[PDB]
C-alpha cells in the first residue's frame, strides 16, 4: 500500500491546485492525520492555503533538485519517519517508503519529464513484476528475526534450531509424467491411463 500512497503523494504534489487530489494525498496513512484533523482542515481556509503553499514549494524543489530531495523535505517537514518509527509496525512501512523513494530516483534520472515519472510509477503499480530483483522487498530490521526458509532454499545450509510445522502434509500427483524403468527416459502420457498415474 505504500506504493499507492507514494503515488497519491506525487500526484498531489504535481498539481496541488486540485483539492480532491491534495485531500486524497493528505488522508493517506503515511501522513498520519486523524479524522478530526481532516474535518477541521476542510473548513479552515488558512490551513488549507498553507498546505497548498508547502506543496507548491515541494513542486519547485522537485523540479530543481530532483525526486529524492522533495521526498526528503516532505518527510522532514511532516515528521513522517519519527511518527512511523513510533507507531507499532511502522518500521516495515518506513523501509518500504525509503525503498520506493530510491527506485523513483533511479527511474527519474533516466526520464527527463517530471510527468513521465508519475506515468512510470502508475504503470509499475498496475503490473508489479515479482521476478524483478530490484523490486524485491528488503529486510525489515537488522535485529534478530525468525528465518522462515523453504526446504529447497535450505539445501547445504545450517541452522541451530529447526522447526517443521507441516512436514506431514502431502499431495497426490494427478498428472501422468514419469520415467520409464527400462529406458530411464522422461515420458509424458497425454492419456490418463492409471498405470502412468
Amino acid at each position: 500500500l505504500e506504493a499507492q500512497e507514494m503515488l497519491w503523494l506525487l500526484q498531489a504534489v504535481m498539481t496541488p491546485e486540485r483539492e480532491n487530489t491534495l485531500r486524497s494525498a493528505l488522508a493517506t496513512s503515511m501522513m498520519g492525520l486523524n479524522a478530526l484533523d481532516i474535518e477541521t482542515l476542510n473548513n479552515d481556509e488558512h490551513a488549507w492555503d498553507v498546505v497548498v503553499e508547502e506543496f507548491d514549494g515541494y513542486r519547485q524543489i522537485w523540479r530543481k533538485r530532483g525526486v529524492m530531495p522533495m521526498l526528503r523535505a516532505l518527510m522532514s517537514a511532516r515528521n513522517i519517519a519519527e511518527n512511523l518509527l513510533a507507531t507499532a509496525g511502522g518500521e516495515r512501512r518506513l523501509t518500504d517508503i525509503l525503498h520506493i523513494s530510491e527506485l523513483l530516483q533511479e527511474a527519474g534520472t533516466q526520464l527527463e519529464s517530471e510527468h513521465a515519472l508519475v506515468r512510470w510509477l502508475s504503470q509499475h503499480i498496475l503490473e508489479p513484476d515479482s521476478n524483478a530483483s530490484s523490486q524485491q522487498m528488503r529486510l525489515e530490521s537488522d535485529k534478530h528475526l525468525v528465518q522462515i526458509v523453504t526446504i529447497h532454499k535450505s539445501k547445504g545450509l545450517e541452522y541451530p534450531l529447526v522447526w517443521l510445522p507441516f512436514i506431514t502434509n502431502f499431495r497426490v500427483q494427478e498428472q501422468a509424467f514419469y520415467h520409464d524403468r527400462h529406458s530411464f527416459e522422461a515420458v509424458l502420457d497425454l492419456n490418463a491411463a492409471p498405470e502412468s498415474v
Binding site: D49, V52, E53
Partner: peptide, 9 residues
Amino acid sequence: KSVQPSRLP
C-alpha cells in the same frame, strides 16, 4: 473573495 495565486486554476 480573495484567492491565492497557487489556488488559482
